[PDB]
Nucleic acid binder design. Structure first.
Ligand SMILES: NC[C@@H]1O[C@H](O[C@H]2[C@@H](O)[C@H](O[C@@H]3[C@@H](O)[C@H](N)C[C@H](N)[C@H]3O[C@H]3O[C@H](CO)[C@@H](O)[C@H](O)[C@H]3N)O[C@@H]2CO)[C@H](N)[C@@H](O)[C@@H]1O
Ligand SMILES: NC[C@@H]1O[C@H](O[C@H]2[C@@H](O)[C@H](O[C@@H]3[C@@H](O)[C@H](N)C[C@H](N)[C@H]3O[C@H]3O[C@H](CO)[C@@H](O)[C@H](O)[C@H]3N)O[C@@H]2CO)[C@H](N)[C@@H](O)[C@@H]1O
Ligand SMILES: [Mg+2]
Ligand SMILES: [Mg+2]
Ligand SMILES: [Mg+2]
Ligand SMILES: [Mg+2]
Ligand SMILES: [Mg+2]
Ligand SMILES: [Mg+2]
Ligand SMILES: [Mg+2]
Ligand SMILES: [Mg+2]
Ligand SMILES: [Mg+2]
Ligand SMILES: [Mg+2]
Ligand SMILES: [Mg+2]
Ligand SMILES: [Mg+2]
Ligand SMILES: [Mg+2]
Ligand SMILES: [Mg+2]
Ligand SMILES: [Mg+2]
Ligand SMILES: [Mg+2]
Ligand SMILES: [Mg+2]
Ligand SMILES: [Mg+2]
Ligand SMILES: [Mg+2]
Ligand SMILES: [Mg+2]
Ligand SMILES: [Mg+2]
Ligand SMILES: [Mg+2]
Ligand SMILES: [Mg+2]
Ligand SMILES: [Mg+2]
Ligand SMILES: [Mg+2]
Ligand SMILES: [Mg+2]
Ligand SMILES: [Mg+2]
Ligand SMILES: [Mg+2]
Ligand SMILES: [Mg+2]
Ligand SMILES: [Mg+2]
Ligand SMILES: [Mg+2]
Ligand SMILES: [Mg+2]
Ligand SMILES: [Mg+2]
Ligand SMILES: [Mg+2]
Ligand SMILES: [Mg+2]
Ligand SMILES: [Mg+2]
Ligand SMILES: [Mg+2]
Ligand SMILES: [Mg+2]
Ligand SMILES: [Mg+2]
Ligand SMILES: [Mg+2]
Ligand SMILES: [Mg+2]
Ligand SMILES: [Mg+2]
Ligand SMILES: [Mg+2]
Ligand SMILES: [Mg+2]
Ligand SMILES: [Mg+2]
Ligand SMILES: [Mg+2]
Ligand SMILES: [Mg+2]
Ligand SMILES: [Mg+2]
Ligand SMILES: [Mg+2]
Ligand SMILES: [Mg+2]
Ligand SMILES: [Mg+2]
Ligand SMILES: [Mg+2]
Ligand SMILES: [Mg+2]
Ligand SMILES: [Mg+2]
Ligand SMILES: [Mg+2]
Ligand SMILES: [Mg+2]
Ligand SMILES: [Mg+2]
Ligand SMILES: [Mg+2]
Ligand SMILES: [Mg+2]
Ligand SMILES: [Mg+2]
Ligand SMILES: [Mg+2]
Ligand SMILES: [Mg+2]
Ligand SMILES: [Mg+2]
Ligand SMILES: [Mg+2]
Ligand SMILES: [Mg+2]
Ligand SMILES: [Mg+2]
Ligand SMILES: [Mg+2]
Ligand SMILES: [Mg+2]
Ligand SMILES: [Mg+2]
Ligand SMILES: [Mg+2]
Ligand SMILES: [Mg+2]
Ligand SMILES: [Mg+2]
Ligand SMILES: [Mg+2]
Ligand SMILES: [Mg+2]
Ligand SMILES: [Mg+2]
Ligand SMILES: [Mg+2]
Ligand SMILES: [Mg+2]
Ligand SMILES: [Mg+2]
Ligand SMILES: [Mg+2]
Ligand SMILES: [Mg+2]
Ligand SMILES: [Mg+2]
Ligand SMILES: [Mg+2]
Ligand SMILES: [Mg+2]
Ligand SMILES: [Mg+2]
Ligand SMILES: [Mg+2]
Ligand SMILES: [Mg+2]
Ligand SMILES: [Mg+2]
Ligand SMILES: [Mg+2]
Ligand SMILES: [Mg+2]
Ligand SMILES: [Mg+2]
Ligand SMILES: [Mg+2]
Ligand SMILES: [Mg+2]
Ligand SMILES: [Mg+2]
Ligand SMILES: [Mg+2]
Ligand SMILES: [Mg+2]
Lengths: 106, 127, 113, 157, 197, 48
RNA sequence: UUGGCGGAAAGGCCUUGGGUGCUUGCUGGCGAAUUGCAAUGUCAUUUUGCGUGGGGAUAAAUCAUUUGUAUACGACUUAGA
RNA sequence: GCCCUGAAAAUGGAUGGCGCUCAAGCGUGUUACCUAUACUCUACCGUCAGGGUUGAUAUGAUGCCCUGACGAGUAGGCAGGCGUGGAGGUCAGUGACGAAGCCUAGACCGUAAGGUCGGGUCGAACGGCCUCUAGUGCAGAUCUUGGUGGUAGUAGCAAAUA
RNA sequence: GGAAUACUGCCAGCUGGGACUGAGGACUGCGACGUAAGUCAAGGAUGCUGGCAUAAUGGUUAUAUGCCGCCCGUCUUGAAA
RNA sequence: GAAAUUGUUGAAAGGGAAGGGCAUUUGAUCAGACAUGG
């Protein structure tokens, strides 16, 4: 209607890392409303999409989407680990990501 | 058109360029193992270039297969080509660089008629 | 100094042999997937089952030397859920791990299985 | 000769597959999906729409109506994992559903006059029931959307 | 959630406000801090003063011009603490600091915008009673900040207009709840409370 | 301290106008010419 | 469209006045499919170039020359329709 | 006990850094959590070991197949390989319809040494396999010779009156 | 006096969500469900549906971004020195 | 007619060196895969 959103807002925070060494193959995601690993278990398995713009066209459109799935839970604050088909650009840190409602077990 | 085979897995696609062949022009990229006593590459300190070792070896099943799946065979003439008649789904024929343009139309012709894949058709080929 | 240990329960032994149970045949670490493997080897002692092995272990008894020696040493993962301590190499009585924790070996070994 | 001929070469005989043991068992369904249960479509063409579950089909999808005269959705396959099952339901007692099956939707444009009646048929039962409980027509008529503050790990549906 | 968050610096605690703001930026949250002169620091004025003088002590010997730069104003005293908690010599951090603004007083765009508070950086909630704490602006002025009175002078003026704005705003919410009376007893009322509204 | 507005008198001595020019002799001396219209309009823009 | 208020970076805030479009406050009549069981999606927002339709305006500066309140060279400062 | 005095050094400066005061300090307790080339499971490369198998029906018994364990490394040892000049043998090998060389932010193969191909430039020779043989592999040696840079349009081109 | 409850422990108790993996390639094994015909999750993934050739996808290369990475060679107990 | 080194043109980058490793966005560039009734 005035709002078409079928997904939960998100943020790409960091790769998985130790103090001095990171692992681009996994990404840590902050999800709106998810404050505890309890809550984040609901979004485990869900599909995420990073949406970005370009110059060239794919089909009629300059908009492209990177796809990945929520994998496990991260820490005590409701962060979530995730893995995308291709790793996220790492400029993407602090950029919005989209956590969908499917696959749905409701 | 070739024996089915599992997914080819290359395990290290990058080149293993010799250390510092980026630094001094006199140093060719052809790999060379660092013998030096202090060398950070030899001692494998974090952040340096990774060296060739045996663990990188290709799967014995997918080794030597080209993206098509044919282990390729070098062919200098039609007699060479015809070694591949039974093994058409195994191997593939690569015309040598020095074979002239006449015999290339000739070798191609027999390879087609024989059902053998030429890796490098459109060889010295006019128009 | 280098080990933690204690007194294993029936389960702990059973689940250790069922999941991780292997045996030694001319070197050759061999999983016990069939009592035939056991009987082929421990049969001269009796012990044709996998629970015959388990029995001969927990009850100790006459052939425990060879019944236990038949068993390959158990390769275990790190404790799922941590070691419970901050620092392992203080004794169980003081700081945890590294020693004879008696019955508490079961909670640990089971989490390492 | 350029290269020297191999001493071996392999067999070009393709090998027969080993005989596999995997049975195809019937699919257990989420307890939340009992025919008559309203659904929320999370993906695809019709995403956002509120629909009505009709039958579990044997290709594993879900029969769907919504019905057409309300939200515009026709009788449709949909996948169980792309749906949220809401806790509101309509009574399905008066819907045939028997004919509709896998090969019904088999790919054989002009909409087949068969289908166009079938929707008029099926939905004629639905709406009459949907009419029975107030505001449900408006409900299925609307689209589902997430609003600021909505938390799907909290929201009941 | 929200594009930009205005934080009222007053009665907050420098290091803890800095810590929460830094993560926001690194996580993409645009931030603006207002009334940085009413920000606080634990410890009594003398201490947090002498502390500054040590900072003041350090400069590149051969050229004081390339040495550590000692910024007096409260917003800058704040930004230092914040920039110290961001990895600012890299591109990421640079970008993140671009997401931040800091002002003493509360300047026009933000003066009519809603301002929030960061409880875990808040002084009264955090510090134990009886512990002494410094007010940033007063310390900032003792090290040579020149703008304190002007900020205060304009702050007093702003507080007048904001008072009158709130006077109208309240009086309207009166006349909104006044006319809400009849519907408070209406049928749609009981309808709504049934579901919790 | 910030400069809010500047208001100029209607007629500027040529000695001042000389100061605004690097090459005065060949310049067309457009001076304050359009600014003086603010007086010519009776008031207002100067007074405001 | 009428008025006010706003100089902290006010460039926004309150207001009159009519015109016009919608309104889910409520009651009707139609449409939606086959985009085929998800991959596809609303177009936002920055600069810049072609263009058309009318509005408005009609400069300097550098070089060379020149002064010595200046000057290693640049720079500085004067002078010349 | 904690804190305070005791408690003086030279560039400006370091609980790692910001900064923290019912701590983001000190003592103590209890849980959750983070991540090593380590541990567990699996795929793949190699090494070592044990077992089966030309009873065969082609194309390798130095094979083919099954199984288990293992993998740090200087000086150093050994192995299996890559590459260059020449030599016997062989492909009745390549080639003026273009050999060799060279150039290719082009392709493929090999863990690697390396191998192969396309395109360009080129002009008269050259390669595969089996063996033989060495004046056989370069980044250094203030190495040798030859060529070329930055320094740099810079130091300078101001004694001997014009 | 009769329970309840905590705590520790066992069940070859029943179930929901997520993740990675699918090595092998006719049959030979050990089994389980069977009154039986036979069926199976029992010595390693199959079934189904869809999507892609102005191309999905994969290689290279340049640039960007996160984290990381001191000059080799040499002697030396110890060299980026 | 190689290299050092240099001119022009084209492309890209550039806040007190540069070059390297992993990963990915972006661009450029290459590819292997299409025959079954008309
Ligand atoms: N060494 C093999 C080659 O190396 C090349 O890269 C390296 C060198 O060979 C090449 O040399 C560059 C050259 O590109 C460039 N056009 C000229 C430059 N002077 C050379 O580089 C040199 O220059 C500096 C001074 O400027 C010297 O102090 C220093 O010895 C060296 N870096 O530049 C790189 C760094 O010097 C390429 N990667 C490739 O052609 C090949 O791998
Ligand atoms: N963060 C600074 C803290 O002080 C430690 O270091 C301290 C000591 O190095 C040094 O102490 C010296 C003492 O050695 C020497 N006699 C000179 C000087 N007058 C003393 O300084 C001391 O002064 C009195 C006690 O005398 C104390 O109150 C004061 O805290 C302490 N700084 O004063 C330093 C600052 O207090 C460490 N840098 C660090 O681990 C600790 O956290
Ligand atoms: Mg990956
Ligand atoms: Mg990867
Ligand atoms: Mg799955
Ligand atoms: Mg990829
Ligand atoms: Mg990958
Ligand atoms: Mg990869
Ligand atoms: Mg390779
Ligand atoms: Mg490498
Ligand atoms: Mg090379
Ligand atoms: Mg050493
Ligand atoms: Mg070539
Ligand atoms: Mg855990
Ligand atoms: Mg620990
Ligand atoms: Mg701890
Ligand atoms: Mg467990
Ligand atoms: Mg476990
Ligand atoms: Mg089988
Ligand atoms: Mg079966
Ligand atoms: Mg300070
Ligand atoms: Mg810092
Ligand atoms: Mg910097
Ligand atoms: Mg500012
Ligand atoms: Mg001053
Ligand atoms: Mg001063
Ligand atoms: Mg005048
Ligand atoms: Mg502003
Ligand atoms: Mg304006
Ligand atoms: Mg304006
Ligand atoms: Mg109106
Ligand atoms: Mg003079
Ligand atoms: Mg003079
Ligand atoms: Mg001069
Ligand atoms: Mg000192
Ligand atoms: Mg300090
Ligand atoms: Mg510390
Ligand atoms: Mg401080
Ligand atoms: Mg402090
Ligand atoms: Mg800390
Ligand atoms: Mg404590
Ligand atoms: Mg916790
Ligand atoms: Mg590993
Ligand atoms: Mg053997
Ligand atoms: Mg070794
Ligand atoms: Mg060793
Ligand atoms: Mg070695
Ligand atoms: Mg050695
Ligand atoms: Mg080898
Ligand atoms: Mg030779
Ligand atoms: Mg010789
Ligand atoms: Mg010869
Ligand atoms: Mg020969
Ligand atoms: Mg010939
Ligand atoms: Mg040659
Ligand atoms: Mg290349
Ligand atoms: Mg050619
Ligand atoms: Mg040329
Ligand atoms: Mg040639
Ligand atoms: Mg000649
Ligand atoms: Mg000739
Ligand atoms: Mg050779
Ligand atoms: Mg020699
Ligand atoms: Mg040489
Ligand atoms: Mg040399
Ligand atoms: Mg040298
Ligand atoms: Mg020179
Ligand atoms: Mg230079
Ligand atoms: Mg000259
Ligand atoms: Mg000169
Ligand atoms: Mg001289
Ligand atoms: Mg002279
Ligand atoms: Mg009693
Ligand atoms: Mg009793
Ligand atoms: Mg219990
Ligand atoms: Mg049961
Ligand atoms: Mg398989
Ligand atoms: Mg059987
Ligand atoms: Mg039975
Ligand atoms: Mg039976
Ligand atoms: Mg049977
Ligand atoms: Mg099987
Ligand atoms: Mg298919
Ligand atoms: Mg790329
Ligand atoms: Mg570093
Ligand atoms: Mg030496
Ligand atoms: Mg020495
Ligand atoms: Mg010495
Ligand atoms: Mg030594
Ligand atoms: Mg000594
Ligand atoms: Mg050294
Ligand atoms: Mg040349
Ligand atoms: Mg050159
Ligand atoms: Mg250029
Ligand atoms: Mg500079
Ligand atoms: Mg420079
Ligand atoms: Mg650097």
């Amino acid at each position: 209607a005035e709002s078409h959103r079928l997904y939960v807002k998100g943020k790409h925070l960091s790769y998985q890392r130790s103090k001095r060494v990171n692992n681009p193959n996994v990404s840590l995601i902050k999800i709106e409303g998810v404050a505890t690993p309890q809550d984040a278990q609901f979004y485990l398995g869900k599909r995420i999409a990073y949406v970005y713009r370009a110059s060239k066209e794919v089909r009629g459109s300059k908009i492209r989407v990177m796809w990945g799935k929520v994998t496990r839970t991260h820490g005590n604050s409701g962060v979530v680990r995730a893995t995308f088909r291709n790793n996220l650009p790492a400029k993407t840190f602090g950029a919005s990501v989209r956590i969908f409602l499917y696959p749905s077990n409701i | 058109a070739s024996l089915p085979h599992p997914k080819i897995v290359k395990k290290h696609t990058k080149k293993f360029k010799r250390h510092h062949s980026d630094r001094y022009h006199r140093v060719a990229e052809n790999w060379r193992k660092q013998k030096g006593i202090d060398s950070v590459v030899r001692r494998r300190f974090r952040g340096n270039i990774s060296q060739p070792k045996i663990g990188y070896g290709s799967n014995k099943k997918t080794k030597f297969l080209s993206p098509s799946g044919h282990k390729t065979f070098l062919v200098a003439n039609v007699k060479d080509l015809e070694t591949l008649t039974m093994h058409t789904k195994t191997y593939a024929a690569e015309i040598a660089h020095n074979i002239s343009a006449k015999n290339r139309v000739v070798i191609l012709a027999r390879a087609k008629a024989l059902g053998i894949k030429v890796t490098n058709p459109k060889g010295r080929l006019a128009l | 100094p280098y080990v933690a240990y204690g007194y294993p329960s029936y389960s702990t032994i059973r689940q250790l042999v069922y999941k991780r149970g292997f045996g030694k045949i001319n070197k050759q670490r061999v999983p016990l997937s069939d009592n035939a493997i056991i009987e082929a080897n421990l049969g001269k002692y009796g012990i044709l089952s996998i629970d015959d092995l388990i029995h001969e272990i927990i009850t100790v008894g006459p052939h425990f030397k060879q019944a236990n020696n038949f068993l390959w040493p158990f390769k275990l993962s790190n404790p799922s859920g941590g070691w419970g301590v901050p620092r392992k190499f203080k004794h169980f009585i003081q700081g945890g791990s590294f020693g004879n924790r008696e019955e508490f070996i079961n909670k640990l070994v089971k989490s390492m299985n | 000769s350029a290269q020297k001929a191999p001493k071996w070469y392999p067999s070009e005989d393709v090998a027969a597959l080993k005989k596999t043991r995997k049975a195809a068992r019937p699919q257990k369904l989420r307890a939340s999906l009992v025919p008559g249960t309203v659904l929320i479509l999370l993906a695809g063409r019709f995403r956002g729409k509120r629909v009505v579950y009709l039958k579990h089909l044997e290709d594993n999808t879900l029969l769907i109506s919504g019905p057409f005269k309300v939200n515009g959705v026709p009788l449709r396959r949909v996948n169980a994992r792309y749906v949220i099952a809401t806790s509101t339901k309509v009574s399905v007692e008066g819907v045939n559903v028997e004919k509709f099956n896998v090969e019904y939707f088999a790919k054989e444009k002009e909409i087949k006059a068969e289908r166009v009646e079938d929707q008029k048929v099926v939905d004629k039962a639905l709406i009459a029931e949907i009419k029975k409980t107030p505001l449900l027509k408006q409900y299925l008529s609307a689209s589902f959307s997430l609003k600021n503050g909505d938390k799907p790990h909290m929201l009941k549906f | 959630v929200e594009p930009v968050v205005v934080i009222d610096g007053k009665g907050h605690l420098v290091g803890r406000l800095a810590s929460v703001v830094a993560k926001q930026l690194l996580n993409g949250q645009k931030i603006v801090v207002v009334r940085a002169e009413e920000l606080n620091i634990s410890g009594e004025f003398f201490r947090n003063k002498l502390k500054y003088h040590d900072f003041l002590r350090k400069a590149t010997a051969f050229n004081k011009t390339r040495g550590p730069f000692h910024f007096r104003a409260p917003s800058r005293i704040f930004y230092k603490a914040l920039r110290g908690m961001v990895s600012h010599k890299t591109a990421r951090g640079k970008a993140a600091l671009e997401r931040l603004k800091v002002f003493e007083g509360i300047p026009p765009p933000y003066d009519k915008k809603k301002r929030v508070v960061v409880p875990q950086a808040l002084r009264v909630l955090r510090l134990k009673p009886g512990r002494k704490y410094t007010t940033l602006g007063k310390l900032s002025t003792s090290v040579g900040w020149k703008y304190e009175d002007v900020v205060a002078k304009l702050e007093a003026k702003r507080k007048v207009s904001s008072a009158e704005y709130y006077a109208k705003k309240r009086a309207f919410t009166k006349k909104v709840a006044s006319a809400n009376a009849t519907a408070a007893e209406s049928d749609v009322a009981k309808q709504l409370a049934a579901l919790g509204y | 301290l910030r400069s809010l507005t500047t208001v100029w008198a209607e007629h500027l001595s040529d000695e001042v106008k000389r100061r605004f020019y690097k090459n005065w002799y060949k310049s067309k001396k457009k001076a304050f010419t359009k600014y003086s219209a603010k007086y010519a309009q009776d008031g207002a823009g100067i007074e405001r």
